[PDB]
From a paper:
One function of Mediator complex subunit MED23 is to mediate transcriptional activation by the phosphorylated transcription factor Elk-1, in response to the Ras-MAPK signaling pathway. The MED23 subunit is the largest subunit of the Tail module and is specific to metazoans. The structure is composed of α-helices that engage in HEAT-repeat motifs, forming five solenoid regions which are designated as HR1 to HR5.
We report the high-resolution cryo-EM structure of MED23 in complex with the TAD of Elk-1, phosphorylated at three positions (T368, S383, and S389). Analysis of the MED23Elk-1 electron density map reveals that Elk-1 binds to MED23 through a hydrophobic sequence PSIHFWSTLSpP (hereafter referred to as «MED23 Binding Motif», or MBM). The binding of MBM is observed on the concave face of MED23, within the MED23 core, at the interface between HR2 and HR3 regions. In MED23, the MBM binding site is formed by four helices: H19, H21 (from HR2) and H28, H30 (from HR3). Within MBM, the HFWS residues form a tight turn in which F378-Elk-1 binds deeply into MED23, is buried and sheltered by the adjacent H377-Elk-1 and W379-Elk-1. F378-Elk-1 is surrounded in MED23 by side chains from residues I339, L343 (H19), F379, G382, S383 (H21), and V533 and M537 (H28). There is no extensive interaction between MED23 and this phosphorylated side chain, as it points outwards of the structure. In particular, residues from S327 to S336 in helix H19 move up to 3 Å, interfering with the interaction network formed on the convex face at the interface of the HR2, HR4, and HR5 regions.
Numbering used by the authors:
A (entry chain B): 374 to 384
B (entry chain A): 53 to 233, 239 to 316, 327 to 501, 516 to 1032, 1061 to 1334
The structure:
């Protein structure tokens, strides 16, 4: 569950 | 033939092989006479003698003989060849060393002789523009020429400054734009203005525009503008060092000035964006910042700088390598030399988060070092021990509240870690997670204290919970605190990947696919009533989603249909003037995506938005056709799925192409006689039936004319009740299909009211209509009023329709009571409140909202029970839904003249509802700009429109203060002409935009003519006054140009009269001779300018500023002005030069946008030259005039105009004909 700048709501 | 050149070269080297000087000279003389009689082509012989490989400055005698020969035989070469010979001669002479014995120097002056001959203007072998461009290409600016030539080249370049001054704008480096989310493009290599041609421009134009770039970067939402300015395309890792340096200097400037929170958030956001989009390297910026800050001295902004660094370190530490973030430790060593112990700041202030930035940075670095362990460990800094102990103790305590910033500090410090982050997150999110019982959202100040990583974690949790609840198909409504917190969190633009892009692209489609209809309704309401700053493409994308949602998915429910209609109307009406064309040009292929199939009201609103945007932006000035434009297909596809006609009064205000389009495509209208006959026949048939299913089927059949609302009116007009069958028919027809019935009921109402008596017959009818709206809940008030106001009646019928609207709004108490209560117990600053939900329940409990015909169901002889569950409502009500309808009603009331008195009463009674308007200032600006001709006589109607929505001849001090306010706003003052405003929630991103729009509204609201307003605005500078300091006159002109360009046409047309007055002045009309070019006549930065040349120079500079800030549609009047006004009054050289200075710099724009105007300008210039030549006895500035004309032909016009200029050139005097002989070719 890493949340960075290059993440998106779609798993 | 082919071997002639080889044979000539062989003969040349055979001659050069001799050693006897006399024999060589004799051979050269024999070749000279052979050449002069025509035995050899001059191009071939000169090229051979000059490109011979044996030529070298060691062979002094051979060099001198060859150059005297080429001087003797150079006179018979075409000018292209001459230019090439000039180039090769300079290339050859460049190789001469600086130190040469004087015994041969006089022998190497033959090259100076030939260059002197070729650069003589009288002989005119080639145009001087070729010579100057070749010389400048070989020797760029600042390079000292070869010592042999020296003064010759220096002065020959020096004779082109008048042309370089003609092709330059006055005070260009001190003109700044207004940033709104072109003419300001810059070179991405050296921040230079792109200059056309190789001419000796001024020194200031060769320096980088650091001031302009810094001013642009200091403004919020300047990311797209700066990318467009620097020409950066999101396609590769460009890594602009100039952009990195500018960002670093901006950070240094901010820290030096630190000796607010929004400002630092803006910088952090800018660094985030530019590092993310591969335009900067974070370690490189850190190292450059370290070098710049080394040995600076006092540094008090260290906490803010480390907070800015943490905003990126926390976000990017998850994947980026640990080596990138290493130099932060060296930066900390530089900016924190104390080595004792830092006291723990009070945790009761927002600054506590900033004071802990370095401790948080070290914690993140230590955690990253703990992952992928070994290699190198990061030890604890000695000073930051108390802070670490405080954080550890706060984490150890298991009972911590939200009174202080302990939650924020723990979230910032331990965001990266997983185990240590559960406790602060739970403590922060349980209160909003808990319809749920949570009503208090997260405070805005607390949200600002968090870091970007914490904000992303919060939004990811909220979005995941929303998706899970939607997939669970549970009927539980979302937490009001959750919805409010989501709306607040969706403001930050550094989280675009999860904030709004993920909200529109993924969350909404997922909720759509999950068939929730409750989550979708809440999200749509949240967007409508809480989102302030949304990028236009996101808005248009959501508009397309709304249209397809309304069209499909069987959303045949009153509430959902109403929400979609209201949301779509608000987005359509809220579009910006400068955004419509770029946003709708992307959907040129498939307009149906952004259009609608059944909402005639939405299509007409889009058309009205199109008209006002094109009027304000002056898109159609200089054109009389719609074909070839982007509006044609949109209008045609609107005519499909929605044929309609526009009233005469509402169509007379449209632009010319729109009016021409709507004169054709006329749609026949149903006659009132046939409408009345149909209504009477339907009523007699309704009363003649006794069954039940037959009536329901007959009166609910699709395709039958929509007359059932008329039937309801006819029934309860005479019998004053509605049977159960009427309710059954209304339930069966459906909300989506009732719109046509409302539309026809509007026309029937207008006809019936027009064909009626007065007194009781109207009081009864208006009471009936009010009862239908409120008591029976048949149709909602805003829908009814919108359908009334979107009609196509004429004259008396239009007056009746607007009278009906006014009576329905004001005669009963139902709407007035609701407006008064909402205004009295509510406030618009929604981000600073905690009890909005309690206020919302209070209002809704006092005034329930009915959407499923509850009143009509109740008022049946057997009562009918309604069992349709309601979707949750969180933000909206009828008062907030009515605002766009009220804007449109204002526009119609302005359009129709006899009903102007009713608008004053409407404003006086319902003007308090604009306190909740999104963009009241922008609305008034558009309204006053659009209806200037209509309101220019009704001065009292203004100051009433302005006072209701926002709230004597003035002297020169008023205008001076008005200009100075914007001047200081752009300059940047700590107090500021306006108080600090939250750009994240206000309509205006910048104080500059806010001041500009307020000033324009205030100027247009005055009861004086546009000519007087414009003349006073120019006179602020053009006539000497106090409190107008010098050395800042360029920015005063910049502010005046901005304001006058934003003002309508009758306000900026006075520049032409001012220019003509300057032309006809004795300064330019006098025949007194001058020594040299009249530089001070056209230069505003002169020592002492008396009065007349001061007026001329200041008028030139003001015209340059106005035309630099003007749009292309406004520039389209310059060619007609030049051909019709200035052409028959120019008779002297000074006037010709003045006009060249006026219009010269702006030819590049015409070339990029409009070519026919450029051609007309060129022809007008040539005719003016002919007139001046004919009138004057002799020309003293032939060289500057010809240089400018050659530059024009060779850079902008090309060979486009030849037939229109041959006749003009052939009639000139022989001297000008000799100079301008190459223009024909």
């Amino acid at each position: 569950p890493s949340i960075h700048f290059w993440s998106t709501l779609s798993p | 033939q082919e071997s002639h050149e080889q044979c000539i070269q062989w003969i040349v080297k055979f001659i050069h092989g001799q050693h006897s000087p006399k024999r060589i000279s004799f051979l050269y003389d024999c070749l000279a006479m052979a050449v002069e009689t025509g035995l050899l082509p001059p191009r071939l012989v000169c090229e051979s003698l000059i490109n011979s490989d044996t030529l070298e400055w060691e062979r002094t005698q051979l060099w001198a003989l060859t150059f005297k020969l080429v001087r003797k035989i150079i006179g018979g070469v075409d000018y292209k060849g001459v230019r090439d010979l000039l180039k090769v001669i300079l290339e050859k002479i460049l190789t001469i060393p600086n130190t040469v014995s004087s015994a041969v120097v006089q022998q190497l002056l033959a090259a100076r002789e030939v260059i002197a001959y070729i650069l003589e203007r009288n002989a005119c072998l080639l145009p001087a523009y070729f010579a100057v461009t070749e010389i400048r290409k070989l020797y760029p600016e600042g390079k000292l020429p070869h010592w042999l030539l020296g003064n010759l080249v220096s002065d020959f370049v020096d004779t082109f400054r008048p042309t370089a001054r003609i092709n330059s704008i006055c005070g260009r480096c001190s003109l700044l734009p207004v940033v709104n989310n072109n003419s300001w493009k810059l070179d991405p290599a050296t921040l230079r203005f792109p200059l056309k041609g190789l001419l000796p421009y001024d020194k200031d134009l060769f320096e980088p525009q650091t001031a302009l770039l810094r001013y642009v970067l200091e403004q919020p939402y300047s990311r797209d503008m700066v990318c467009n300015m620097l020409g950066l395309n999101k396609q590769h890792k460009q890594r602009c060092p100039v952009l990195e340096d500018q960002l670093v200097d901006l950070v240094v400037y901010a820290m030096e000035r630190s000796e607010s929170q929004l400002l630092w958030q803006h910088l952090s956001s800018q660094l985030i964006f530019f590092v993310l989009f591969q335009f900067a390297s974070f370690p490189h910026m850190v190292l450059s910042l370290h070098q710049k800050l080394a040995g600076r001295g006092l540094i008090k902004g260290r906490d803010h700088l480390m907070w800015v660094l943490l905003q990126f370190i926390s976000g990017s530490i998850q994947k980026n390598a640990l080596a990138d973030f290493l130099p932060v430790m060296k930066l900390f060593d530089l900016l924190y030399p104390e080595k004792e112990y830092i006291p723990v700041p009070d945790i009761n202030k927002p600054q506590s988060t900033h004071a802990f930035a370095m401790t948080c940075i070290w914690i993140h670095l230590n955690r990253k070092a703990q992952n992928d362990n070994s290699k190198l460990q990061i030890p604890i800094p000695h000073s930051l021990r108390l802070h670490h102990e405080f954080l550890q103790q706060s984490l150890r305590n298991k009972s911590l509240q939200m009174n202080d910033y302990k939650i924020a500090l723990l979230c910032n410090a331990y965001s990266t870690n997983s185990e240590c982050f559960t406790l602060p997150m739970g403590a922060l999110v349980e209160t909003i997670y808990g319809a749920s019982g949570s009503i208090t959202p997260l405070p805005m100040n607390l949200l600002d204290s968090l870091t970007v990583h914490a904000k992303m974690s919060l939004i990811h949790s909220i979005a995941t919970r929303v998706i899970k609840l939607a997939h669970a198909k549970s009927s539980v409504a979302l937490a009001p605190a959750l919805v409010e917190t989501y709306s607040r969190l969706l403001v930050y633009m550094e989280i675009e990947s999860l904030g709004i892009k993920g909200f529109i692209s993924q969350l909404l489609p997922t909720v759509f696919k999950s068939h929730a209809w409750g989550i979708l309704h809440t999200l749509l309401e949240m967007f409508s009533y809480r989102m302030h700053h949304i990028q236009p493409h996101y808005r248009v994308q959501l508009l397309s989603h709304l249209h397809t949602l309304a069209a499909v998915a069987q959303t045949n429910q009153n509430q959902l249909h109403l929400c979609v209609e209201s949301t779509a109307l608000r987005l359509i009406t809220a579009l910006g003037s400068s955004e419509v064309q770029p946003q709708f040009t992307r959907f040129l292929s498939d307009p149906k995506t952004v259009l609608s199939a059944e909402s005639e009201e939405l299509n007409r609103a889009l058309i009205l938005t199109l008209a006002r945007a094109t009027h304000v932006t002056d898109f159609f000035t200089g054109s009389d056709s719609i074909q070839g434009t982007w509006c044609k297909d949109i209008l045609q596809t609107i005519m499909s799925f929605t044929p309609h006609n526009w009233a005469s009064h509402t169509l007379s205000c449209f632009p010319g192409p729109l009016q021409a389009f709507f004169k054709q495509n006329n749609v026949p209208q149903e006659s009132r006689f046939n409408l009345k006959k149909n209504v009477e026949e339907e009523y007699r048939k309704w009363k003649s039936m006794s069954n039940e299913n037959d009536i329901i089927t007959h009166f609910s059949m699709q395709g039958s004319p929509p007359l059932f609302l008329c039937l309801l009116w006819k029934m309860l007009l005479e019998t004053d009740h509605i049977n159960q069958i009427g309710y059954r028919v209304l339930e069966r027809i459906g909300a989506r299909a009732l719109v046509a019935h409302v539309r026809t009921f509007a026309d029937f109402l207008v006809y019936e009211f027009s064909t009626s008596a007065g007194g009781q017959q109207l009081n009864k009818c208006i009471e009936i209509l009010n009862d239908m709206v409120w008591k029976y809940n048949i149709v909602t008030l805003d829908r009814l009023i919108l359908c009334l106001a979107m009609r196509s009646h004429e004259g008396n019928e239009a007056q009746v329709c607007y009278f009906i609207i006014q009576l329905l709004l004001l005669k009963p108490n139902d709407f007035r009571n609701r407006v008064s209560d909402f205004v009295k117990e509510n406030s618009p600053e929604h981000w600073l409140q905690n009890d909005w939900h309690t206020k919302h329940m209070n209002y809704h409990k006092k005034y329930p909202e009915k959407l499923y015909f509850e009143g009509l169901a109740e008022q049946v002889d057997p009562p009918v029970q309604i069992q349709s569950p309601y979707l949750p409502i969180y933000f909206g009500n009828v008062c907030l839904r009515f605002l766009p309808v009220f804007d449109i009603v204002i526009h119609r009331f302005l359009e129709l003249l006899p009903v102007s008195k009713s608008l004053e009463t409407l404003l006086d009674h319902l003007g308090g509802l604009y306190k909740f308007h999104d963009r009241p200032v922008t609305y008034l600006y558009n309204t006053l700009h659009y209806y200037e001709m209509h309101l220019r006589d009704r001065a009292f109607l203004k100051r009433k429109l302005v006072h209701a929505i926002i709230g004597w001849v003035p002297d020169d001090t008023y205008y001076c203060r008005l200009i100075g306010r914007l001047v200081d706003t752009m300059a940047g003052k700590s107090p500021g002409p306006f108080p600090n405003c939250d750009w994240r929630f206000n309509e205006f991103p910048n104080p500059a935009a806010h001041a500009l729009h307020v000033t324009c509204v205030e100027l247009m609201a005055l009861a004086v003519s546009g000519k007087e307003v414009g003349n006073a605005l120019l006179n602020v500078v053009l006539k000497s006054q106090p409190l107008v300091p010098r050395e800042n006159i360029t920015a005063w002109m910049n502010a005046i140009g901005l304001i006058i360009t934003a003002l309508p046409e009758p306000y900026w047309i006075v520049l032409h009269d001012r220019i003509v007055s300057v032309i006809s002045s004795p300064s330019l009309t006098s025949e007194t001779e001058w020594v040299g070019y009249p530089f001070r006549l056209f230069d505003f930065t002169a020592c002492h300018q008396s009065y007349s040349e001061m007026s001329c120079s200041y008028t030139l500079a003001l015209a340059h500023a106005v035309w630099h800030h003007s749009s292309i549609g406004q520039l389209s009047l310059i060619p007609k002005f030049l051909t019709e006004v200035l052409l028959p009054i120019v008779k002297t050289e000074f006037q010709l030069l003045y006009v060249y200075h006026l219009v010269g710099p702006f030819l590049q724009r015409f070339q990029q946008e409009r070519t026919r105007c450029m051609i007309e300008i060129g022809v007008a210039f040539y005719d003016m030259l002919l007139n001046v030549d004919q009138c004057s006895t002799h020309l003293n500035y032939m060289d500057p005039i010809c240089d400018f004309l050659y530059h024009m032909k060779y850079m902008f016009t090309g060979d486009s105009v030849k037939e229109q200029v041959e006749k003009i050139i052939c009639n000139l005097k022989p001297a000008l004909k000799l100079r301008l002989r190459f223009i024909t070719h």
